[PDB]
Paper text:
In this study, we present the crystal structure of a class-I KARI from the thermoacidophilic archaeon Sulfolobus acidocaldarius at 1.75-Å resolution. Gel filtration showed that in the presence of 2 mM Mg2+ Sac-KARI is a dimer with a molecular weight of ~70 kDa (the theoretical molecular weight of the dimer is ~74 kDa). In addition, probably because of the presence of 2 mM magnesium in the lysis and purification buffers, a Mg2+ was seen in each active site, surrounded by the side chains of E227 and E231 of one monomer and D191 of another. The Sac-KARI crystal structure shows an “open” state with the active site exposed to solvent, similar to the structures of apo-Ia-KARI and Mt-KARI-Mg2+ complex. In conclusion, Sac-KARI is one of the rare enzymes that displays high activity at elevated temperatures, a board range of pH tolerance and is able to utilize both NADH and NADPH as co-factors.
The BCAAs are synthesized from pyruvate by a common pathway that involves acetolactate synthase (ALS), ketol-acid reductoisomerase (KARI), and dihydroxy-acid dehydratase (DHAD). As a bifunctional key enzyme, KARI catalyzes an essential two-step reaction for BCAA biosynthesis. Proteins of both classes fold into an N-terminal Rossmann domain and a C-terminal “knot” domain.
Numbering used by the authors:
A (entry chain B), B (entry chain A): 2 to 330
């Protein structure tokens, strides 16, 4: 697939545009800081004069209520939680849209699932950096940057890909590299990864391994080092060198064990259930169910966070993190 | 558990002893470099004059053939691959052992499974740091250190735990903290983590999720970012702030999906199969099976490595790491 880097993209297409960054969480901050450093006129737009508003004041912005930021801008960037974008949009963005304005997202969920339904006469596009806000910012600030995906949903102007690329350049992404996708692809793949692998899957895998050891009578601190803490070593090596690289770096005892037992533990029925999860994303069932849960108060999340907070593993983990911090220079 | 720090041991217990570090891979290097900085007399002993040998020379060591390092030393540290230790021991160490010498390990495997059966007149102990060699070295050299586990197998002197902690102090581990375990516990828990979690488990988990997306027709590059590359972001968060902190850092959508779908994918039958793997470790079946396999050339590893090296997943990953490399500061 085509990879775009600094050289392939001009800022001219957004240089003269006023950008509203809606939100000043971890992403909103990073983007607002990078855009402003790249010479883009940024207004931060916020629903409340709360902690976010203060943080933005602390960074030399003068924040505005959402609607005032929108009325004074050309390019509107939604860096708000997915579940509250709909309400902010309808009440504080929609009535202010004019021909030729742009709606810009970091995630495809709301557009793809019709929670925000834009008019036909604006451009709609996305830049999805592949790192946390702090890194997005740090790397840009050191003359590098983080890769991202870009997509266009509605290209009314004919320049929507160029504009998406320019935004991505202004936040440092083209220093690393950018690849084009679609709103649908980014949404479905992001939901799938989070559910089966990145958050759901690996958390349950690590937690089961930890529990198995503690239930068999081994020391909890030993069990935590072996099943949770060491995972960084492994995943750092995959990130840096691929699986091949990682496998070369571990013992032959580890390779033999991982190759023979790994597939018995994570067997074909797991893959079959991942297919089912993907089917549930693709049919819309997952998004329907989540929107329904959220509408009832997200009690699943509250109960699960309480269980994690009070678990044995969390207690043990805290203690080993004091030990690691104690020796970190 | 009791955590030991610098206040719990004086280097005096080993300051006057000559140490042979057998091997000069990433661990042998780190330990040799730290010990010498702590003012411990270090000799590097090696079976061949190849790359390890040259690196030791680069670091200012004059390396010796293994048996010459042993004859000239009091404390023999095995920092060699587990499956070669037995033959190095029989051929190059055991003939030269004398009362009061120490046999020191970084992993319990060879002592626990009777592949090395030490004589009755030596101490036998272990120090098992909980980070890669480079870090062992880096933190030490920066005035911190990395935590480790210690264990005693045969305490002929009555001071084996003091000597283990002293070696750990000399490589900086007591700057962070050290926990005592046993050779059995270290062995069984290290085998278990590699097999079901750290290597076997997570690799099968990530590959299967990649494969699911690719099979469904998503762009492989997108699939790789979402199922493999982004793992580092989550695991880093767990490493730094535990599961509660990771979960606070991800979206509510991610939380809900991980808590509901993750548990459907990684169900309690996975745990049950982890328990069977642990039973197979505990009975010695795994170790028998591996020792047998290794003695036949470890053809399982070679074919597994080829299969990984020419996988779609791996081809994709090569490209994307140029991207990231391209933007790091
Ligand atoms: Mg993502
Ligand atoms: Mg280990």
């Amino acid at each position: 697939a085509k990879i775009y880097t600094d050289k392939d993209v001009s800022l001219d297409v957004i240089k003269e545009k006023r950008v509203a960054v809606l939100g000043y969480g971890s992403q909103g901050r990073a983007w607002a800081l990078n855009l402003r450093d790249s010479g883009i006129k940024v207004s931060v737009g916020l629903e409340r004069e709360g902690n976010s508003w203060k943080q933005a004041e602390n960074d030399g912005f003068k924040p505005l209520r959402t609607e005032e930021a929108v009325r004074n801008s050309d390019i509107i960037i939604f860096l708000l939680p997915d579940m509250i974008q709909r309400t902010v949009y309808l009440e504080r963005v929609k009535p202010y849209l004019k021909e030729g304005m742009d709606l810009v997202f970091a995630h495809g969920f709301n557009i793809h699932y019709r929670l925000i339904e834009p008019p036909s006469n604006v451009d709609v596009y996305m830049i999805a950096p592949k790192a946390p806000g702090p890194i997005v910012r740090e790397y840009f600030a050191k003359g590098g940057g983080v890769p991202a995906l870009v997509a266009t949903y509605q290209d009314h102007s004919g320049k929507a890909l160029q504009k998406a690329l320019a935004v991505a350049k202004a936040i440092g992404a083209t220093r690393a590299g950018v690849i084009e996708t679609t709103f649908k692809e980014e949404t479905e793949t992001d939901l799938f990864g989070e559910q089966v692998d990145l958050v759901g899957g690996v958390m349950q895998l690590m937690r089961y391994a930890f529990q198995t050891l503690v239930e068999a009578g081994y020391q909890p601190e030993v069990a935590y080092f072996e099943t949770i803490n060491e995972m960084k070593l492994i995943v750092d090596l995959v990130y840096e060198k691929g699986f091949s690289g990682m496998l070369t770096a571990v013992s032959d005892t580890a390779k033999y064990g991982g190759m023979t037992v790994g597939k018995m533990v994570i067997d074909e029925s797991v893959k079959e259930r991942m297919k089912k999860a993907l089917d549930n994303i693709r049919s819309g069932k997952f998004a329907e169910k989540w929107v329904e849960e959220y509408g009832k108060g997200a009690n699943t999340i509250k109960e699960g966070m309480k269980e994690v907070d009070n678990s044995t593993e969390e207690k043990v983990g805290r203690s080993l993190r004091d030990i690691i911090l104690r020796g970190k220079p």
